[PDB]
Amino acid sequence: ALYTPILILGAIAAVFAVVSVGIALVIGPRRFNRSKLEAYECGIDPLPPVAAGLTGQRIPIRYYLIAMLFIVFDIEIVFLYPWAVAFDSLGLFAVIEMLLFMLTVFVAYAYVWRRGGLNWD
Amino acid sequence: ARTSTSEAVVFWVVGTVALVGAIGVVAARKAVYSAVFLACTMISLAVLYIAQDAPFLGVVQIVVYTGAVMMLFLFVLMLIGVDLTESLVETIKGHRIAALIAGAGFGILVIAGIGNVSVAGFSGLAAANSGGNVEGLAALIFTRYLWAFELTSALLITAALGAMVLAHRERFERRKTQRELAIERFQTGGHPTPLPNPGVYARHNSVDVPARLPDGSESPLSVSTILPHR
Amino acid sequence: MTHPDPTLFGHDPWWLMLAKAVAIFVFLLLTVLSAILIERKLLGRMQMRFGPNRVGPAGLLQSLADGIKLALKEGLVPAGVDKPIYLLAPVISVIPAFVAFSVIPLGGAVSVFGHRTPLQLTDLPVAVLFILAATSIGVYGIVLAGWASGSTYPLLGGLRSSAQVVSYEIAMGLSFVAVFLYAGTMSTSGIVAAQDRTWFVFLLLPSFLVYVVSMVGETNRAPFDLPEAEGELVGGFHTEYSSLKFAMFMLAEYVNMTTVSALATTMFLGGWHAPFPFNLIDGANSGWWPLLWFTAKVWTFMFLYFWLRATLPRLRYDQFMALGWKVLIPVSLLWIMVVAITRSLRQHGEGTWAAWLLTAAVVVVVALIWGLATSLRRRTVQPPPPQSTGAYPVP
Amino acid sequence: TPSIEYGLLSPMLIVFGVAIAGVLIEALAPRQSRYPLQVTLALGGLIATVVAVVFVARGLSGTPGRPAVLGAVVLDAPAVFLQGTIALVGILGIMLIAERQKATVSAGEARGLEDFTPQASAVAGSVAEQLATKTGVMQTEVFPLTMFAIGGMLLFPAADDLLTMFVALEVLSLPLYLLCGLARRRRLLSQEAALKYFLLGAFSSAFFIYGAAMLYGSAGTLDLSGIAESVAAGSGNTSLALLGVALLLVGVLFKVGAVPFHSWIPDVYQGAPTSITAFMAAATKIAAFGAMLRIFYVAVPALRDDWRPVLWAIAILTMVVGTVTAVTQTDVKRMLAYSAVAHSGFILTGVIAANPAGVSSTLFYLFAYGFSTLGAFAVVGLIRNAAGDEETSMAQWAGLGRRYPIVGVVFSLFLLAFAGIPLTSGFVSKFAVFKAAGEGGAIPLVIIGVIASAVAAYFYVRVIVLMFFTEPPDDAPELVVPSGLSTAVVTVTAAVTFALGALPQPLLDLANSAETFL
Amino acid sequence: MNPDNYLYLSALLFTIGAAGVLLRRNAIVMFMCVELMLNAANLAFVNFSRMHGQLDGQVVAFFTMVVAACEVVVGLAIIMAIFRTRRSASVDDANLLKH
């Protein structure tokens, strides 16, 4: 229990959104046009159906390193929440424990930063 | 031991989503579809964690795996492709059948080993969550499991070191700056000032269209190097 | 004590919790329909215009008119799109946006038709992180809309949405920690109750700033409206979307604005407690007035949003991410450490030692950040050499 | 509040703090000063770790042992023995890893004799990689990573609960996943090895965690002693206990390399940096077998009649497929990999003993075999093709001993030890495990191990034939002795393999005193 | 609904994850399948912890998620290096070491 209001609000939202998309597709004019249905390219003809030999199959991101670091850091930061909420109940022992853990995280972060890991985007 | 029929409904719908999501992860031939299916499965498992009297675990599941599947989607776009539809055709002679058999057998055997267990006593979690689910997790993590919590830092550091050593590219492979490019015998402008635009024709103005030289031939420079002519 | 208050939450009759959900839904709809018109009129004023003032009296219907127009408009489904995901993306953006707002305290307990119930749809032991999870799911709508549209500009917009997450997610998560630390809970009712003595904005100012920046980022609002970036990507991810699907994207963005501003109020501005000028007034925190105060604070955040739009360019998303990982994350992490040590010392009687630390720590941060700003980087200069092209003589 | 036995946890704490300090050295130390500090910081730390362990050994003289962190870590005699072994093997491994190139005419000497590519993020053979090699840059991040592995491998024997073992398994595996892909030459092979090892290690760790889940379900706790009390007390779910034991065994057997799970080792040991190959083939085997000893002698002894028959088969397969597959292997590195596969089964025989002699024999076997394997892989690293690539094809080794009698003799000693000929620690080692197995009722395993050793002696001996009994070919590989560190590793290792075979009672008394778990 | 059903689901999910690692060449897909196995283990821990009236398994799920994140990042690093050298993320292509 205690979650069924969240489910009611989610159900209201999902019905609202699904019916919204249905209205989008159903209400208003509809006329087939190959030009209308073609990709937007600022008015220029979009590439042939076979976009090109190779072509935009793969998109490099310049922050792959920061994305990888984000994975680990985001997961590792969730340990703070139980520590934060249990603070004043765990005592100085936990304070020192998390200070050491956060210093370890800081060392990781400083190694990443000072060695240019955060720079290429 | 039978949990509330509401929990039954939640399990059935959500675990249906989770099982279908895993199946799509394995079966979807577009990697982006597989990523989305993984996100669905993670969300469903988070819902199950909440339903099993594990609020914080489920919520953290949603959060962290939203992040994780976003990054895995980025890496799918980088390393695999934007909408590449992989063949999924067995390349190792008979490997597909052997893998299906082994997976099914392992699943059947694990189900057999699990068998009926809950009938042997299912102590609800209320006595534990009382006082705060997160409070209980904090009590355990920083009291009994403090050493493992500390070693998670080693895991994090090792991941960072691996990323930096294998992924980060030092100065030698650093891409030249726009500032750098403009320089060096006035690069990028001395040379075909701004390379000639693709040709514009009636019925064809796309970038793949090569421009026409005075004699009527097609200028190779007008069309980019990467395009497959036209 | 153990929030959510078990004597208040989880005991609504089915119809009453249905009505509270319906009221929250209608409130969010009217709040978005307001925010649209109010933002346009306030931007006009900040640019010396009147903004919309014709459609209906005083231009009231302009937001409603735009919504109905988008409804009455052709439902486009371009060829070359992943039809399923292309149609789902607005739904994935919308549902979580509405869901997140469920655990937002719009008031204290009130006796509606005898039933004592909160002016709040419900509350959870981990409510704040539940909002975070809903908002994080919502970004899948943006990213999958960008990707599924099968066009270069939507693709770039969706990639910018992914980068946007990589920038703001960790900063937001860390910004929550200090509030949890002073509150001793993750429920929003508990976080508001813990603010009876004083609002955490004064106590947790660094956390407030980090959270607000990560917020403006999370909603994709200027100067971090990068996924759209109409000046660069035309329409970003919501290119190729028209009619109610685009309308749903924008409604999702505005509901995210409302949700995150309501959270900011909840966990930094005493939630629904009346401001200082009405703090001393009798019953200012009882009955329906708390709803007025909550809406007032939320709309001050809305004003901050509009003001940011009207007075800042948009960063390049790499610059924004460098902000997040070089300023927001380090600052939030060091603030969490400093606040933890401060509370531990105060609980151990050290007293002044904490004040010397706290004040000093920020004083150090305010320096080193400026170090990354002007005193050590981003304030240098250089020269360059000429080429063979017979360049003139620079006086 | 929790009570932390710092004196007990001292070795692991020292190693992990040293790893953190090494990452700091990478973070805020200038390039030219990084390597001198790291090799300084690493080796000293491990030496300190060694020192710590011996004092901890003195600490456990009276009591059999003690837990440290409210369970989750128990320093008992087997734990300190395995931790000391891993510390020594780590010292040797880091002496191998720190070996720099043999400065010929230029100052570009940069940790290349260690076989580490100057910039692992670069495309192999790219102009960037070539320019980095010319500039003599080294990714010193290796030293912390290695240390982290040791830290994990120090804990993994000493972990006293499922969660700590799983965390330690990941902590030791991830560094090795990364290290396997940093080789200086044959970079394609090293990268493939890293990918294979990561994929299969992640698979095995998934099995490990799922088995931990099943054991926890059966027992209602994840401290090993609690699991033992549950299974012995008969209160828990026996079927779940068995399934969890099996799934956990899957992971631990992957870590040691049993035949059903060994397939990675040939490729990974071939393609990984020779230094990292030497380091891992000892350290990971030691840590995995220590953990498996703990699980089968602390966590789940009562279910012996249930898991004995399984290990039996595995051991059989391990000895047979591991040895037979090696008979016709033509690459020295891959042959040593299959030799390690076979010796995993040899160890597993003494684990199957399920008696104190089993533990003593296993500990001695791990010590002696880890040392011997580390030495053999270091020697295989010393042999070079004319192009610089480590010559590993057995044909190029013809007459290698004749051209280099000292290294030939040392490598022949290592091979004889692996075969288990007497006067080598390898004999005493195999004898101990076989004696434990027979005394434990597993004589048939002793017979099968006898047969497997007879088969393996052939491929151990063919290499000696190539070294000494054949004239060197026209293009014989030369012996490069990059630095005195590698020489010290080879000398210490061979000297151990020989002394510990002639007069093994030292360290065999210590193995005996480490026959009981807490 | 018998709580044991969750375990079956976990068993199924792990199974599918296992099958994925055997059937899909793309290294990213393999990583997602490994994540599926780890999450199935988490589900088993959560159910068992609910059964035993203690949060231990819920704690273990956190550490499993941490390990999953670190493993995924390490695999991503290895795959990035391999992709740079080869421009392919297929595991089958890493076949040089054999026999």
Side-chain angles (χ1 to χ4, degrees), chain A residues 1-19 21-37 39-44 46-49 51-53 56-73 75-87 90-92 94-96 98-121, chain B residues 1 3 5 7-41 43-52 54-69 71-82 84-85 87-89 91-92 94-95 97-99 101-115 117 120-129 131-134 136-143 145-149 151-169 172 175 177-179 181-183 185-186 188-207 209-217 219-224 226-228, chain C residues 2-4 6 8-38 40-65 67-81 84-110 113-115 117-118 120-168 170-195 198-201 203-217 219-224 226-227 229 231 233-275 277 279 281 283-333 335-336 338-345 349 351 354-356 360-364 367-369 371 373 383-386 390-391 393 395, chain D residues 2-4 6-30 33-59 62-65 67-98 100-101 103 107-110 112 116-122 124-128 132-133 135-140 142-159 161-169 171-198 200-222 224-228 230-254 256-279 281-304 307-332 334-388 392-395 397-429 431-438 440-461 463-470 472-473 476-477 479-502 504-508 510-514 516-517, chain E residues 1-3 5-29 31-34 36-70 72-86 88-92 94-99:
Chain A
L2 183 73
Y3 285 84
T4 176
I6 306 196
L7 270 63
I8 291 166
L9 185 60
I12 291 291
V15 168
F16 160 86
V18 69
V19 164
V21 177
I23 287 160
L25 296 174
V26 172
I27 302 300
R30 296 206 83 251
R31 180 169 183 73
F32 169 84
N33 181 307
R34 294 170 173 76
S35 186
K36 185 191 294 177
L37 305 179
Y40 171 73
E41 192 56 31
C42 294
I44 298 309
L47 284 169
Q57 305 192 16
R58 284 176 296 89
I59 310 302
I61 72 163
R62 314 178 58 240
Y63 56 96
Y64 47 72
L65 178 46
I66 303 186
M68 299 174 54
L69 298 152
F70 156 84
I71 296 167
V72 290
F73 281 120
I75 179 54
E76 290 282 296
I77 290 167
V78 309
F79 284 119
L80 295 162
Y81 303 131
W83 170 77
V85 308
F87 207 93
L90 306 168
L92 176 59
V95 189
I96 297 169
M98 188 75 75
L99 284 172
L100 176 52
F101 170 79
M102 185 180 288
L103 281 170
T104 316
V105 172
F106 263 113
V107 168
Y109 202 72
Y111 167 74
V112 170
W113 186 350
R114 200 159 180 292
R115 296 292 294 280
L118 308 179
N119 281 346
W120 196 57
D121 204 57
Chain B
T3 76
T5 56
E7 172 161 335
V9 173
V10 169
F11 165 77
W12 284 122
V13 305
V14 177
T16 303
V17 173
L19 193 64
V20 168
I23 286 166
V25 160
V26 175
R29 46 173 72 241
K30 284 170 179 172
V32 172
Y33 275 61
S34 62
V36 175
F37 275 123
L38 182 73
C40 286
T41 293
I43 288 160
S44 304
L45 288 176
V47 172
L48 297 185
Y49 299 161
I50 299 162
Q52 286 169 323
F56 179 68
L57 170 61
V59 172
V60 173
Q61 180 81 358
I62 301 183
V63 175
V64 307
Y65 276 101
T66 285
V69 180
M71 308 304 80
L72 287 165
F73 161 92
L74 282 176
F75 278 103
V76 161
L77 301 188
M78 184 180 288
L79 311 163
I80 290 155
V82 173
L84 178 54
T85 299
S87 69
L88 309 195
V89 173
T91 45
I92 298 165
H95 172 82
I97 293 161
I101 290 163
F106 172 79
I108 294 294
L109 293 160
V110 163
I111 288 163
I114 297 161
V117 58
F122 190 86
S123 54
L125 204 60
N129 274 346
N133 176 235
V134 289
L137 296 168
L140 266 56
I141 293 158
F142 306 100
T143 305
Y145 302 113
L146 164 58
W147 202 235
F149 161 61
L151 296 149
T152 56
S153 75
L155 293 171
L156 161 61
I157 280 171
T158 51
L161 290 161
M164 283 298 273
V165 167
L166 299 169
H168 189 235
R169 298 194 287 167
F172 308 115
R175 75 165 73 254
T177 311
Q178 184 269 306
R179 184 185 207 285
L181 279 176
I183 309 168
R185 196 170 48 177
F186 183 42
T188 74
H191 303 292
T193 301
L195 271 174
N197 60 318
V200 178
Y201 298 70
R203 312 175 183 167
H204 303 289
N205 58 27
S206 48
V207 299
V209 181
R212 181 180 291 157
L213 285 163
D215 71 346
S217 72
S219 51
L221 302 178
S222 59
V223 57
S224 180
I226 62 170
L227 290 160
Chain C
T2 56
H3 300 98
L8 179 63
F9 288 87
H11 313 301
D12 293 335
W14 69 284
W15 64 262
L16 179 47
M17 74 187 213
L18 173 56
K20 270 168 52 176
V22 161
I24 290 290
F25 184 81
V26 167
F27 169 83
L28 280 168
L29 264 294
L30 278 71
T31 298
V32 169
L33 198 149
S34 305
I36 300 276
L37 176 60
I38 301 302
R40 290 161 76 181
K41 294 177 82 85
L42 262 52
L43 290 175
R45 294 308 192 109
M46 287 180 240
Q47 291 145 358
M48 317 189 57
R49 306 201 314 289
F50 289 105
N53 71 346
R54 290 191 171 276
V55 184
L60 289 175
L61 293 177
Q62 175 59 56
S63 174
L64 181 55
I68 294 168
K69 181 267 293 186
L70 287 166
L72 267 291
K73 203 146 175 64
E74 163 174 36
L76 183 77
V77 181
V81 311
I85 296 89
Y86 174 81
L87 294 167
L88 274 296
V91 177
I92 293 162
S93 189
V94 166
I95 292 167
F98 275 102
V99 163
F101 195 82
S102 62
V103 301
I104 294 294
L106 285 81
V110 64
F113 311 139
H115 271 275
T117 56
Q120 168 169 7
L121 176 52
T122 192
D123 201 10
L124 268 45
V126 295
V128 170
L129 271 64
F130 174 87
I131 285 161
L132 184 62
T135 54
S136 77
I137 292 163
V139 179
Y140 278 105
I142 313 306
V143 171
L144 297 169
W147 170 84
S149 296
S151 161
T152 308
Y153 286 108
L155 180 65
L156 294 180
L159 264 59
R160 283 187 182 196
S161 182
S162 295
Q164 186 71 38
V165 175
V166 176
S167 182
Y168 79 77
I170 294 181
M172 216 168 162
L174 286 167
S175 69
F176 290 156
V177 176
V179 161
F180 300 160
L181 174 52
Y182 287 170
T185 185
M186 318 177 54
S187 172
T188 48
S189 308
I191 283 161
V192 171
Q195 280 174 91
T198 181
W199 298 357
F200 293 155
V201 64
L203 308 179
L204 302 180
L205 180 67
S207 186
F208 173 78
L209 271 70
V210 171
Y211 172 69
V212 160
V213 171
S214 185
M215 157 176 79
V216 177
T219 61
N220 316 299
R221 288 302 314 266
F224 314 140
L226 301 158
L233 303 184
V234 187
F237 73 98
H238 68 60
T239 304
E240 300 299 330
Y241 280 94
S242 69
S243 190
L244 278 190
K245 289 167 281 162
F246 165 72
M248 280 313 95
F249 282 115
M250 289 313 293
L251 176 142
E253 189 175 3
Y254 272 88
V255 167
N256 276 325
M257 293 177 70
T258 311
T259 304
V260 189
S261 302
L263 187 58
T265 307
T266 291
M267 65 180 288
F268 289 112
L269 300 177
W272 46 263
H273 296 313
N279 267 335
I281 301 292
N285 297 311
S286 309
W288 311 102
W289 300 109
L291 184 58
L292 160 60
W293 312 128
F294 164 84
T295 305
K297 300 178 181 69
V298 170
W299 272 93
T300 57
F301 280 110
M302 287 300 174
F303 169 74
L304 178 60
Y305 268 117
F306 310 155
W307 198 14
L308 285 168
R309 193 181 207 162
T311 191
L312 290 176
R314 87 174 71 81
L315 287 176
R316 305 183 293 152
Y317 74 88
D318 75 327
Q319 290 161 332
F320 171 52
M321 206 177 72
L323 164 75
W325 277 80
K326 304 186 171 182
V327 172
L328 295 185
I329 283 172
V331 167
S332 55
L333 186 64
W335 179 239
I336 293 153
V338 166
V339 175
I341 299 156
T342 290
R343 181 167 260 254
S344 178
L345 290 168
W356 177 95
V362 299
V363 162
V364 162
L368 62 94
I369 192 180
Chain D
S3 175
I4 305 182
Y6 296 106
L8 298 182
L9 302 150
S10 187
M12 294 182 286
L13 280 159
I14 283 165
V15 162
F16 280 114
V18 165
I20 290 161
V23 175
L24 273 170
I25 300 318
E26 292 308 308
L28 56 87
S33 77
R34 283 205 279 268
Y35 166 89
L37 271 48
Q38 290 284 32
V39 71
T40 301
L41 171 49
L43 290 177
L46 287 172
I47 289 163
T49 302
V50 167
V51 166
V53 171
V54 295
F55 284 116
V56 178
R58 287 192 182 192
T63 50
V69 186
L70 190 153
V73 174
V74 182
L75 277 152
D76 45 25
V80 290
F81 186 100
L82 291 158
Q83 281 193 345
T85 310
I86 287 163
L88 292 154
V89 162
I91 291 170
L92 299 177
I94 285 177
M95 293 177 71
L96 293 177
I97 290 157
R100 300 177 84 171
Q101 291 206 141
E109 182 179 1
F116 287 107
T117 186
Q119 194 84 19
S121 59
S126 66
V127 63
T133 308
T135 56
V137 307
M138 65 183 73
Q139 282 170 321
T140 44
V142 174
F143 291 102
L145 282 172
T146 309
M147 295 299 291
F148 276 114
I150 292 164
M153 293 183 286
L154 287 176
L155 170 61
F156 191 67
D161 64 23
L162 274 292
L163 178 56
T164 310
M165 293 183 286
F166 176 61
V167 168
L169 188 155
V171 163
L172 67 88
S173 301
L174 295 188
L176 300 170
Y177 301 160
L178 297 168
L179 292 154
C180 282
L182 314 174
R184 177 157 282 232
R185 293 150 300 272
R186 303 195 186 91
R187 288 212 57 216
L188 281 299
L189 272 55
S190 173
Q191 291 181 329
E192 161 176 321
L195 171 58
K196 282 175 170 178
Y197 184 42
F198 169 82
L200 304 165
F203 211 56
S204 77
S205 65
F207 282 95
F208 189 106
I209 186 61
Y210 198 68
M214 290 321 153
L215 277 177
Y216 171 68
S218 77
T221 176
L222 59 83
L224 297 177
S225 187
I227 283 158
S230 179
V231 301
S235 180
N237 182 291
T238 310
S239 67
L240 274 187
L242 294 169
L243 175 62
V245 165
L247 292 165
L248 192 72
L249 175 63
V250 163
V252 76
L253 290 178
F254 168 90
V256 301
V259 161
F261 297 98
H262 81 298
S263 294
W264 64 282
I265 288 178
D267 302 5
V268 176
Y269 285 15
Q270 182 184 3
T274 303
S275 180
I276 293 299
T277 312
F279 163 57
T284 62
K285 202 173 297 295
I286 296 153
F289 273 111
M292 182 179 72
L293 278 171
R294 209 174 198 71
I295 287 154
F296 284 117
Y297 284 74
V298 182
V300 68
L303 313 184
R304 56 211 288 132
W307 55 257
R308 183 159 308 166
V310 190
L311 298 188
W312 272 50
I314 290 147
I316 292 160
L317 283 169
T318 311
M319 300 201 252
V320 171
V321 169
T323 52
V324 177
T325 310
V327 163
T328 198
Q329 198 53 253
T330 62
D331 185 299
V332 170
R334 212 171 173 73
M335 183 278 288
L336 289 174
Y338 284 105
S339 159
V341 171
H343 283 238
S344 297
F346 288 138
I347 299 155
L348 190 62
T349 70
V351 175
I352 285 163
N355 57 17
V359 187
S360 168
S361 55
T362 311
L363 288 184
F364 180 99
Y365 192 88
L366 293 170
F367 189 104
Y369 174 75
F371 265 67
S372 309
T373 305
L374 191 151
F377 277 115
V379 170
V380 164
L382 299 188
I383 310 310
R384 292 285 151 193
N385 173 11
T392 57
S393 187
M394 293 177 70
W397 280 49
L400 183 68
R402 290 203 166 253
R403 284 161 52 73
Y404 304 106
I406 309 297
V407 72
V409 162
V410 164
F411 196 67
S412 73
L413 162 62
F414 291 138
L415 290 171
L416 297 158
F418 300 141
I421 315 304
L423 301 182
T424 76
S425 60
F427 169 66
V428 179
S429 179
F431 178 96
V433 292
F434 291 164
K435 184 196 80 91
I443 300 167
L445 282 72
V446 174
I447 294 154
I448 285 166
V450 173
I451 287 162
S453 191
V455 166
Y458 166 84
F459 75 75
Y460 287 122
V461 160
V463 182
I464 300 169
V465 172
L466 286 159
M467 283 166 254
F468 281 107
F469 307 161
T470 310
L479 170 68
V480 75
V481 171
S483 196
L485 295 179
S486 59
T487 296
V489 167
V490 170
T491 54
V492 166
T493 306
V496 163
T497 305
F498 166 56
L500 188 53
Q505 185 56 29
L507 175 66
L508 192 54
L510 298 184
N512 298 344
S513 71
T516 51
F517 291 82
Chain E
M1 183 278 288
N2 193 319
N5 287 29
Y6 288 107
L7 297 171
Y8 305 146
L9 175 57
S10 82
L12 290 165
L13 291 163
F14 199 101
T15 301
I16 292 156
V21 175
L22 303 200
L23 295 165
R24 296 299 298 264
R25 287 183 290 279
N26 284 339
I28 313 306
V29 184
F31 301 169
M32 302 181 321
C33 295
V34 174
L36 280 174
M37 320 162 90
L38 295 175
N39 285 270
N42 292 348
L43 179 64
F45 278 109
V46 175
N47 173 257
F48 284 134
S49 183
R50 198 183 188 211
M51 179 190 298
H52 294 292
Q54 64 199 7
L55 301 170
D56 291 324
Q58 307 199 359
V59 174
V60 175
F62 295 177
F63 293 83
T64 305
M65 272 150 54
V66 165
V67 162
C70 293
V72 162
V73 161
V74 165
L76 284 165
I78 298 160
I79 288 300
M80 272 283 282
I82 284 165
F83 181 85
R84 285 186 206 295
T85 48
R86 219 186 300 268
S88 168
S90 160
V91 300
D92 290 11
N95 192 40
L96 276 291
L97 308 158
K98 63 174 72 176
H99 300 149

